[PDB]
């Protein structure tokens, strides 16, 4: 556990840290070393000045040169050691996640990882960089003060030193606590990031059903628990400083008393105590500078727990292992024998209860059965995503468990049940099948898949960017690309899973010929619910209760009159705006700023205290009195001590609490603003689920660190150094002019520092969203990328996007290092200058050296406080850009608004939809005319069927009615009223849709069905009443935990039919006036298809419907049918009228002639 964050440090990284620490000790001694020349001048106080002062000044000019080197070496080296290690952490951690199996993805929540990559790693960067360097600068200063003490003092040093262990232990006690709190706070943010990743993926269903309020308030809760842990961390860290500062001034008071005995004993002089106090007191302020460094390291330690926990884990069925067995001449042989298997998520249920099969080379197997018998499990087992409990899957004699994984997976082509594509060009989607592929092969492969014509018709033919998960293309076209992708591979075993579900009759027909032409050499297994495709296969198989019962040729199974016979028979500007948002918390700043000046301004004042204390010690010549008045001063240190406890704690608590209220305020509004946006906004190439969720975590975290507790210290350092120059202006004279004249040189260096950094961060921020895009793309589609065997390519792609920040991180160190060293060094020369200037003025008798020595002593305490403000600049530069983007997104307003109350909400509705002369284009592709002036009539109590070939604008009508996009020209009238003129939500409350490819949320089944109806308490009796009509009651009832079983991410646990049937239920909870079915019975059984139709037909009257489907048996029943053609509605009417006038409809139905 201990020091497990520095695992990937090279010999050159080691060299940086060792050389940095040695320089850090040398740099820290210089401020303690300045007091040595003062002590000898006090000894002289019991001709001189011009010879003595120049010697002491001459030393300061040399020190400044030593600081300019050491400071650069100190700061620069750690920053390099951080940047290189962080680069290796991100690359290793991502590689570790891809090494996992599917069962691990099934159990744990994958949505948490995306925020663990960007935010949680960035916390470590702050911990193990410059703060480690400064920590040693502080610690050298602390000890080097005592090193003078041992020479100058025998007991006085020991008396102060002996109360170091409390400071030493206290730091360990508070750190170990707040280190534990960090793990729990980060876990709260991870739970929030999962909600954002889920919602932004399925935004269309969220907009459709209109559940923005519920998802917003749920997202809010996770932030509430994060705030409560945050405020606890603030209280703890600020108390750590108060007690430490209290104990030092308390111990200083104890040290004074024994100092009073010098007159009685005669052990040492008053010249000694001034040396001892001036030596030892400097280190007191160094502790306050060290308090942030320990707090950073403790949080950075707390950040590491969960990252290395994933890296330390080892897989079961490893893909990266090269110790497997790989044969040469793989003849086609597949054997199942007595195979039992159950998933990890529900171990109680038994799906496969002993089956067996033999498939020789040159055989196309058909698997038939009802939804739930486990056809997809068999296909998913072949790839070896899960292993069997008993039974052996042997290939060509040898068992799968003995042979190699990667070698096995690169000879199996798989078209999954519901395909998914990656957001790139069409060429790259085809290229994921195999690396070294030529254009000629792709040309041939597409033409076999029958997806050539539409690719030729689109501009940028092979360079058209498909959306996230292939959303921009149609349902049919998307499926063909998956078919091509398998055929480019050219494997031995081909595995089709309902490959011709969304495709029409003509596309199925020609694709069948291409597959059947080049079948002889291959081995094939085909899943299908159409039976015409099943007719010409070699062997058919029937599942039943886990076991495969029936087998054989078409003739035999017909004569045997089993399940197959029944199936065949049945078919027949930053501070001004950002500060203003937190107008409420005004009394926190008033107390915080007031307290910072009082506790900050005490440190330069010591010289005034020490001068008066020294003066009162030698005021009156009489000795007995000195005993009494000296005792009171010791009480004064305790009094300041007890107040110091009150000031520092309150200062830190007031500022610390203020930030945590704002942090949550920033997040809540941005997520609320993003959820208002139009669909057109989500279709932009720049906007993506991964790109957005990264934008949430990064922007808030950048703002939080700059203006939180860290703001407070700067206020203390400004007041300190202000008080320093004020008392220099008051008591001193002709010094401020020489001191202040060097300040513009720091100012010129400061402006060029921020200008170089602030310009750099904008280019860095833009790239990191590009980095985030790939992770969310790879993680969400894990089954695709595992099946395709493309684990390296994504790591290589991920390595590119990280390379541009990596350069900036290295460059940043040198810019930051040069400014620090210069800003630090220019002060020392000023401390040389003032003494040398004092050498001239004292001689001529215009300035009093006794008073000059005090201002010299007073000004030099700020030297460290000057160094604190120098380290602030980068944080301000990153916040400036981060803030601008937040105000940009919040202030933006959409075209069609969901939160606007205005519109017309008519008390009743007749339910008559009309379309007339409608032209429309999508925003992403402006030139292509999808609809070219169509018209359509829909009245109450009627079902209108829409038909045509794949990609003739059927699903566009559904989307146009739901107000995702508005028409360019034309008109839509609801009951003789413009849909633009109506209220937005009001419309979406009445009508309800069933999408082409359903999506579900990570929740219980009851809540997914209850999600359909919002703004009302859904009764359970109605849920079961609906789910009885939907026809999934017996399935849910047989399952353990009833409705409380948690469905997976995007409906991954349940089978297609099971979720698709839920989607049907979710629609029927509302009892809508207008209804829209877009291939609602795509993948369902013949037994189900009737029972689903019965409920619709029995309760058809009253409401209105528009059906889209390829099954002519459904369209047979409908009132009037409509046929599309290149945008124009060519054919329309009733079944007898359309069949009489023998056009395309006759050609469409006659293709099924006997
Ligand atoms: N990853 C999984 N985790 C848990 N249970 C699963 C998983 N995949 C499938 N199941 C369950 O196993 C059973 C069989 O599912 P499977 O999809 O293999 O059957 P199917 O006949 O192919 O379904 P369909 O006909 O709808 O395509 C179902 O009851 C389903 O809920
Ligand atoms: N958001 C979008 N951006 C760009 N083009 C789109 C978008 N949505 C649809 N299209 C294009 O419009 C054409 C037809 O659209 P649509 O998918 O509605 O037809 P469809 O009848 O639903 O097709 P299918 O029957 O194959 O599902 C397709 O070629 C598709 O690429
Ligand atoms: Mg299936
Ligand atoms: Mg469609």
From Swiss-Prot:
Cytoplasmic side: 80-128, 179-234, 295-589, 656-710, 753-812, 874-1154
Transmembrane annotation, as ranges: 11-33, 59-79, 129-150, 158-178, 235-258, 273-294, 590-610, 635-655, 711-731, 733-752, 813-835, 852-873
Residues annotated as domain ABC transporter: 334-570, 913-1151
Subcellular location: Cell membrane; Apical cell membrane; Cytoplasm
InterPro entries: AAA+_ATPase, ABC1_TM_dom, ABC1_TM_sf, ABC_transporter-like_ATP-bd, ABC_transporter-like_CS, P-loop_NTPase, Type_1_exporter
Record-listed ATP 1 binding positions: 369-376
Catalysed reactions, as listed in the record: ATP + H2O + xenobioticSide 1 = ADP + phosphate + xenobioticSide 2; ATP + H2O + phospholipidSide 1 = ADP + phosphate + phospholipidSide 2; a 1,2-diacyl-sn-glycero-3-phosphoethanolamine(in) + ATP + H2O = a 1,2-diacyl-sn-glycero-3-phosphoethanolamine(out) + ADP + phosphate + H(+); a 1,2-diacyl-sn-glycero-3-phosphocholine(out) + ATP + H2O = a 1,2-diacyl-sn-glycero-3-phosphocholine(in) + ADP + phosphate + H(+)
Effect of residue 765 to N: In a colorectal cancer sample; somatic mutation
Class of enzymatic activity (EC top level): translocase
Major localisation: membrane
EC code(s) of this entry: 7.6.2.2, 7.6.2.1
Residues involved in ATP 2 binding: 948-955
Keywords on record: ATP-binding, Cell membrane, Cytoplasm, Disease variant, Glycoprotein, Lipid transport, Membrane, Nucleotide-binding, Phosphoprotein, Repeat, Translocase, Transmembrane, Transmembrane helix, Transport
One Gene Ontology term, aspect cellular component: apical plasma membrane
Top-level lineage group: Eukaryota
GO biological process: carboxylic acid transmembrane transport; cellular hyperosmotic salinity response; cellular response to alkaloid; cellular response to antibiotic; cellular response to borneol; cellular response to dexamethasone stimulus; cellular response to estradiol stimulus; cellular response to external biotic stimulus
Residue ranges, Extracellular side: 151-157, 259-272, 611-634, 732, 836-851
Gene3D superfamilies: ABC transporter type 1, transmembrane domain, P-loop containing nucleotide triphosphate hydrolases
Function in brief: Translocates drugs and phospholipids across the membrane. Catalyzes the flop of phospholipids from the cytoplasmic to the exoplasmic leaflet of the apical membrane. Participates mainly to the flop of phosphatidylcholine, phosphatidylethanolamine, beta-D-glucosylceramides and sphingomyelins. Energy-dependent efflux pump responsible for decreased drug accumulation in multidrug-resistant cells.
Family in the record: Belongs to the ABC transporter superfamily. ABCB family. Multidrug resistance exporter (TC 3.A.1.201) subfamily.
Disease the record associates with this protein: Inflammatory bowel disease 13: A chronic, relapsing inflammation of the gastrointestinal tract with a complex etiology. It is subdivided into Crohn disease and ulcerative colitis phenotypes. Crohn disease may affect any part of the gastrointestinal tract from the mouth to the anus, but most frequently it involves the terminal ileum and colon. Bowel inflammation is transmural and discontinuous; it may contain granulomas or be associated with intestinal or perianal fistulas. Encephalopathy, acute transient: An autosomal recessive neurologic disorder triggered by specific drugs, or acute febrile or afebrile illness. Clinical features include encephalopathy, ataxia, spasticity, pyramidal signs, diplopia, vomiting, and coma. Symptoms fully resolve within few days.
The name this protein goes by in its record: ATP-dependent translocase ABCB1
Organism: Homo sapiens
Gene expressing this chain: ABCB1
């Amino acid at each position: 556990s201990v020091f497990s964050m520095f695992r990937y440090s090279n010999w050159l990284d080691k060299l940086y840290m060792v050389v940095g620490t040695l320089a850090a000790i040398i740099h820290g001694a210089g401020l303690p070393l300045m007091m040595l020349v003062f002590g000898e001048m006090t000894d002289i106080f019991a001709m001189n000045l011009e010879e003595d002062m120049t010697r002491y000044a001459y030393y300061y000019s040399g020190i400044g040169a030593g600081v300019l080197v050491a400071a650069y070496i100190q700061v620069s080296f750690w920053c390099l050691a951080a940047g290189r290690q962080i680069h290796k952490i991100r690359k290793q951690f991502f590689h570790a996640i891809m090494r996992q199996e599917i069962g691990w993805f099934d159990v744990h929540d994958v949505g948490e990882l995306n925020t663990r990559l960007t935010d949680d790693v960035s916390k470590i960067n702050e911990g193990i960089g410059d703060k480690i360097g400064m920590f040693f600068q502080s610690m050298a200063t602390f000890f080097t003060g005592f090193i003078v003490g041992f020479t100058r003092g025998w007991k006085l040093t020991l008396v102060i030193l002996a109360i170091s262990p409390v400071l030493g232990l206290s730091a360990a006690v508070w750190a170990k606590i707040l280190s534990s709190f960090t793990d729990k706070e980060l876990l709260a943010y991870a739970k929030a990031g999962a909600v954002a990743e889920e919602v932004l993926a399925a935004i269309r269903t969220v907009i459709a059903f209109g559940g923005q309020k519920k998802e917003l308030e749920r997202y809010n809760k996770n932030l509430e628990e994060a705030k409560r842990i945050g405020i606890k961390k603030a209280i703890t860290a600020n108390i750590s400083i108060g007690a430490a500062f209290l104990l030092i001034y308390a111990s200083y008071a104890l040290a004074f008393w024994y100092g009073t005995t010098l007159v009685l004993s005669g052990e040492y002089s008053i010249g000694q105590v001034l040396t001892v106090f001036f030596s030892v007191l400097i280190g007191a302020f160094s502790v306050g500078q060290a308090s942030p460094s320990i707090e950073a390291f403790a949080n950075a330690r707390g950040a590491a727990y969960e990252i290395f926990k994933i890296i330390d884990n080892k897989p079961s069925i490893d893909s990266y292992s090269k110790s497997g067995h790989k044969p040469d001449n793989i003849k086609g042989n597949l054997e199942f024998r007595n195979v039992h298997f159950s998933y990890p998520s529900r171990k109680e249920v038994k799906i496969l209860k002993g089956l067996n099969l033999k498939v020789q080379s040159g055989q196309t197997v058909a698997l038939v059965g009802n939804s739930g018998c486990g056809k997809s499990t068999t296909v998913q087992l072949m790839q070896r995503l899960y292993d069997p409990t008993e039974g052996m899957v042997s290939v060509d004699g040898q068992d799968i468990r003995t042979i190699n994984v990667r070698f096995l997976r690169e000879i199996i082509g798989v078209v999954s049940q519901e395909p998914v594509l990656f957001a790139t060009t069409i060429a790259e989607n085809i290229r994921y099948g195999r690396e070294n592929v030529t254009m000629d092969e792709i040309e041939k492969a597409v033409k076999e898949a029958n997806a050539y014509d539409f690719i030729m018709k689109l501009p940028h033919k092979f360079d058209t960017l498909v959306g996230e998960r292939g959303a921009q293309l149609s349902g049919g076209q998307k499926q063909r690309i998956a078919i091509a992708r398998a055929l480019v591979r050219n494997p031995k075993i081909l595995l089709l899973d309902q490959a011709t579900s969304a495709l029409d009759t003509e596309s199925e027909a020609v694709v069948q010929v291409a597959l059947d032409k080049a079948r002889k050499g291959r081995t094939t297994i085909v899943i299908a619910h159409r039976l015409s495709t099943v007719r010409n296969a070699d062997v058919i198989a029937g599942f039943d209760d886990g076991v495969i019962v029936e087998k054989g040729n078409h003739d035999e199974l017909m004569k045997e009159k089993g399940i197959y016979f029944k199936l065949v028979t049945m078919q027949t500007v930053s501070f001004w705006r950002i500060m203003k948002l937190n107008l409420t918390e005004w009394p926190y700043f008033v107390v915080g700023v007031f307290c910072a000046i009082i506790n900050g301004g005490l440190q330069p004042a010591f010289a005034i205290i020490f001068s008066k204390i020294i003066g009162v010690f030698t005021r009156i010549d009489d000795p007995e009195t000195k005993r009494q008045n000296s005792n009171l001063f010791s009480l004064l240190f305790l009094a300041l001590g007890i107040i110091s406890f009150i000031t520092f704690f309150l200062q830190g608590f007031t500022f610390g609490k203020a930030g945590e209220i704002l942090t949550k305020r920033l997040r809540y509004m941005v997520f609320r603003s993003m959820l208002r946006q139009d669909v057109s906004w989500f279709d932009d190439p720049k906007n993506t689920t991964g790109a957005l969720t990264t934008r949430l975590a990064n922007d808030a975290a950048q703002v939080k660190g700059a203006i939180g507790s860290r703001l407070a210290v700067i206020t203390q350092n400004i007041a300190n150094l202000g008080t320093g120059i004020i008392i220099s202006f008051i008591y001193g004279w002709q010094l401020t002019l020489l001191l202040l004249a060097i300040v513009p040189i720091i100012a010129i260096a400061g402006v060029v520092e921020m200008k170089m950094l602030s310009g750099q961060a904008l280019k860095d921020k833009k790239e990191l969203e590009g980095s985030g895009k790939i992770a969310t793309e790879a993680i969400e589609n894990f089954r695709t990328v595992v099946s395709l065997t493309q684990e390296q390519k994504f790591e290589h792609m991920y390595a590119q996007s990280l390379q541009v920040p990596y350069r900036n991180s290295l460059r940043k160190a040198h810019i930051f290092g040069i400014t620090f060293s210069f800003t630090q060094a220019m002060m020392y020369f000023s401390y040389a200058g003032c003494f040398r200037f004092g050498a001239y003025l004292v001689a001529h008798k215009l300035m009093s050296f006794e008073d000059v020595l005090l201002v010299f002593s007073a000004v030099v305490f700020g030297a460290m406080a000057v160094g604190q403000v120098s380290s602030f600049a980068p944080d301000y530069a990153k916040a400036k850009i981060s803030a601008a983007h937040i105000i940009m997104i919040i202030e933006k307003t959409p075209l069609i608004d969901s939160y606007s109350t205005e519109g017309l909400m008519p008390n009743t509705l007749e339910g008559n939809v009309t379309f007339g002369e409608v032209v429309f284009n999508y925003p992403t592709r402006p030139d292509i005319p999808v609809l070219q002036g169509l018209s359509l009539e829909v009245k109450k109590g009627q079902t209108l069927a829409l038909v045509g070939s794949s990609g003739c604008g059927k699903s566009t009508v559904v989307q146009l009615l739901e107000r995702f996009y508005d028409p360019l020209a034309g008109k839509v009238l609801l009951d003789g009223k413009e849909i633009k003129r109506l209220n937005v939500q009001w419309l979406r409350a009445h009508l309800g849709i069933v999408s082409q490819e359903p999506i579900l949320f990570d929740c219980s089944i009851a809540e997914n069905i209850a999600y359909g109806d919002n703004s009302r308490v859904v009764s359970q009796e109605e849920i079961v009443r609906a789910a009885k009509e939907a026809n999934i009651h017996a399935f849910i009832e047989s399952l353990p935990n009833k409705y409380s079983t948690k469905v997976g991410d995007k409906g991954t646990q349940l089978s297609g039919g099971q979720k698709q049937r839920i989607a049907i239920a979710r629609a029927l909870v509302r009892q809508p006036h207008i209804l829209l079915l877009d291939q609602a019975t795509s993948a369902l059984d013949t037994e189900s298809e009737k029972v689903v139709q019965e409920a619709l037909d029995k309760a058809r009257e009253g409401r209105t419907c528009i059906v889209i489907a390829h099954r002519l048996s459904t369209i047979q029943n409908a009132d009037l049918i409509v046929v599309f053609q290149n945008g124009r509605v060519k054919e329309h009417g009733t079944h007898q009228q359309l069949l009489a006038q023998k056009g395309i409809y006759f050609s469409m139905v006659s293709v099924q002639a006997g």
